[PDB]
Amino acid sequence: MDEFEMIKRNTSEIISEEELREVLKKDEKSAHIGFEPSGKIHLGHYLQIKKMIDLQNAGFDIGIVLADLQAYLNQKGELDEIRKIGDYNKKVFEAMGLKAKYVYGSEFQLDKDYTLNVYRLALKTTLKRARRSMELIAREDENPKVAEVIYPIMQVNGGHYLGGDVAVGGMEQRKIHMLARELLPKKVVCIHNPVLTGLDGEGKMSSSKGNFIAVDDSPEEIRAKIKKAYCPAGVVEGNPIMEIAKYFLEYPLTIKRPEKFGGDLTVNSYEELESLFKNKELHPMDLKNAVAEELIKILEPIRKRLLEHH
Amino acid sequence: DEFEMIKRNTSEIISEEELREVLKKDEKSAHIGFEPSGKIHLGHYLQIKKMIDLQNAGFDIGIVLADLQAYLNQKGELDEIRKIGDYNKKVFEAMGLKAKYVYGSEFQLDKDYTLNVYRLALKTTLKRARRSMELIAREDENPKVAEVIYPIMQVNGGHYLGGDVAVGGMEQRKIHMLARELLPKKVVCIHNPVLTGLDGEGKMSSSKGNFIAVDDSPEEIRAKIKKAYCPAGVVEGNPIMEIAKYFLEYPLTIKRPEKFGGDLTVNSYEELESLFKNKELHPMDLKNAVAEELIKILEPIRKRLLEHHH
Numbered sequence: 001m002d003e004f005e006m007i008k009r010n011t012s013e014i015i016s017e018e019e020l021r022e023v024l025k026k027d028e029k030s031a032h033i034g035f036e037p038s039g040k041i042h043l044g045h046y047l048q049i050k051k052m053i054d055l056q057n058a059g060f061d062i063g064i065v066l067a068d069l070q071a072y073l074n075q076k077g078e079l080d081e082i083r084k085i086g087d088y089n090k091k092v093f094e095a096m097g098l099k100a101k102y103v104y105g106s107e108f109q110l111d112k113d114y115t116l117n118v119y120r121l122a123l124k125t126t127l128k129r130a131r132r133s134m135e136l137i138a139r140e141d142e143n144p145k146v147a148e149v150i151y152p153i154m155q156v157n158g159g160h161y162l163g164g165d166v167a168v169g170g171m172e173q174r175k176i177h178m179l180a181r182e183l184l185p186k187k188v189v190c191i192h193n194p195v196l197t198g199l200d201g202e203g204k205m206s207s208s209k210g211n212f213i214a215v216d217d218s219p220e221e222i223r224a225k226i227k228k229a230y231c232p233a234g235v236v237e238g239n240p241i242m243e244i245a246k247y248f249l250e251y252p253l254t255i256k257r258p259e260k261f262g263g264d265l266t267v268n269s270y271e272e273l274e275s276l277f278k279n280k281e282l283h284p285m286d287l288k289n290a291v292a293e294e295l296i297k298i299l300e301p302i303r304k305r306l307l308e309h310h
Numbered sequence: 311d312e313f314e315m316i317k318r319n320t321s322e323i324i325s326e327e328e329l330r331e332v333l334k335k336d337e338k339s340a341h342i343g344f345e346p347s348g349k350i351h352l353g354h355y356l357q358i359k360k361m362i363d364l365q366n367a368g369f370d371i372g373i374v375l376a377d378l379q380a381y382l383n384q385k386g387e388l389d390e391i392r393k394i395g396d397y398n399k400k401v402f403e404a405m406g407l408k409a410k411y412v413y414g415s416e417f418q419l420d421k422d423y424t425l426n427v428y429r430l431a432l433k434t435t436l437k438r439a440r441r442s443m444e445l446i447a448r449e450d451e452n453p454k455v456a457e458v459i460y461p462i463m464q465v466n467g468g469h470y471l472g473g474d475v476a477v478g479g480m481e482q483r484k485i486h487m488l489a490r491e492l493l494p495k496k497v498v499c500i501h502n503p504v505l506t507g508l509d510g511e512g513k514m515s516s517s518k519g520n521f522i523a524v525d526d527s528p529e530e531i532r533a534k535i536k537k538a539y540c541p542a543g544v545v546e547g548n549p550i551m552e553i554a555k556y557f558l559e560y561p562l563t564i565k566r567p568e569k570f571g572g573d574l575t576v577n578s579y580e581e582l583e584s585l586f587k588n589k590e591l592h593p594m595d596l597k598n599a600v601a602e603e604l605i606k607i608l609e610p611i612r613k614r615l616l617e618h619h620h
Contacts, residue, residue, distance in 0.1 A: 073428055110421040119382060122455040127436070130455050146439050146462060147431035149455045 042212035062100035201230030340475035346394035351521035510539030
């Protein structure tokens with residue numbers, strides 16, 4: 001498919017599609033994403049890195065912000081420990097095939113002129129707006145800290161310093177991105193990716209909740225996690241197994257079954273799989289088994305590349 | 311002794327026992343911060359007088375022209391705020407203060423400073439920060455993120471300054487108690503009273519225009535005092551009695567006709583309070599004495615400031 005449709009595929013929104021099309025005409029163009037460093041790199045990370053790879057394949061220069069200062073403000077621990085996790089994340093992203101340049105937020109988010117602009121943004125940003133933009137990002141705290149409202153203006157100014165053509169993030173970033181769109185002059189094209197459902201179906205996938213498949217999980221860990229995963233028959237919305245099939249698997253997809261239960265099945269698209277499951281022609285245990293074996297193979301080159309370092 | 315001179319006309323010392331230990335040192339320092347003010351009024355003068363007390367006790371005095379705090383508190387642009395701070399420095403010098411001056415922005419934007427601000431932001435709840443600013447923050451229907459950065463900015467300012475004593479008005483007491491809670495070194499805090507506004511309506515402040523400026527013309531001083539709140543017998547919230555307590559010299563002679571026994575001569579504010587509570591001294595006699603003595607007290611300050619126009 002053409003570069004626009006490749007970038008648009010499996011995204012939740014593009015703000016705006018018209019301006020992205022204009023960006024694609026340029027010979028030099030850049031896209032950035034930030035990640036708070038995470039002890040485990042899970043399928044949620046992988047979904048976004050795949051989107052960055054789409055962009056690199058469309059001729060964008062990719063920048064990855066290892067967001068150590070934001071993680072610090074978000075009570076994730078001490079800076080030098082966060083940065084060491086950031087280094088490991090960089091290796092994992094490389095193992096995924098990403099071709100990017102990497103920087104720690106702290107390399108530029110602590111100089112005088114940056115800090116003065118954070119304070120200028122602080123004068124323009126209401127507390128109510130800052131908290132609302134952090135609702136899905138802030139780590140749980142019964143006594144919310146000042147650091148929670150510095151976080152979004154820290155991030156907004158980061159996008160300002162980076163000065164790319166495109167900013168990518170999950171839908172939980174949407175309010176911060178729209179805050180930047182109204183505090184800053186220079187407008188970036190925003191691409192927002194969906195946020196995956198946790199494996200037990202209770203809320204979204206997140207590193208703190210341990211409700212995820214990590215890209216370096218063992219094949220039997222993946223099988224076991226999918227076995228116990230929430231996957232009610234006929235139910236597609238909020239079904240994590242259907243999400244993995246939508247966002248990671250390749251089509252045509254073959255689902256093996258005993259002929260006692262209809263024999264092997266071949267699905268040409270995710271939509272065909274959707275109605276198959278909605279009409280209950282496909283049992284969850286047969287969905288799970290095929291999702292698990294195909295996912296294992298997709299993650300194998302990543303896991304292998306990381307294991308050969310030992 | 312030095313302790314009693316320092317304590318005189320203060321509202322509290324946190325703590326007296328610590329101050330007594332600080333007085334045992336050959337070398338000791340004390341600092342105070344001022345958001346630059348377009349007029350310098352009796353509230354400022356009261357605090358500068360206390361700094362002069364400390365200097366006379368062997369303290370090295372540091373004055374922070376708190377431009378970045380004023381910036382965060384919506385007082386305008388930094389360039390203009392610094393120009394007002396320069397003007398304030400000249401008024402404080404005309405008061406007789408031997409002090410070193412510094413703009414907060416000279417050190418409050420360094421990377422290690424900003425990093426410790428963010429470290430303090432992790433430790434300070436939003437509720438605590440907002441409560442600490444109740445008497446300081448500019449009124450705002452939609453409170454900004456800058457409001458909760460201000461107190462931790464000020465807390466870290468004392469940490470960097472490393473003085474033995476911090477001086478301020480009673481409106482500062484919550485920020486200072488937050489500092490003593492959060493910082494590894496507890497600084498002695500000397501808090502001066504906040505004066506009552508001329509109409510008795512509330513506290514005196516620059517934003518409410520209910521003050522006497524130290525360079526007000528004698529005619530203006532007389533007009534302000536004449537209209538001031540001063541009910542016979544009432545001492546609390548009486549700004550005219552406050553001026554007699556904090557600025558006038560004793561023994562102090564109240565001119566009235568021999569029709570009323572003098573030329574009532576009083577050698578303590580306590581004896582003045584006795585006569586006024588007893589309704590032996592009419593507010594009009596009190597006002598006329600307070601005005602003419604206050605004019606004489608402020609005259610050398612106003613004269614030194616008027617000389618600057620060649």
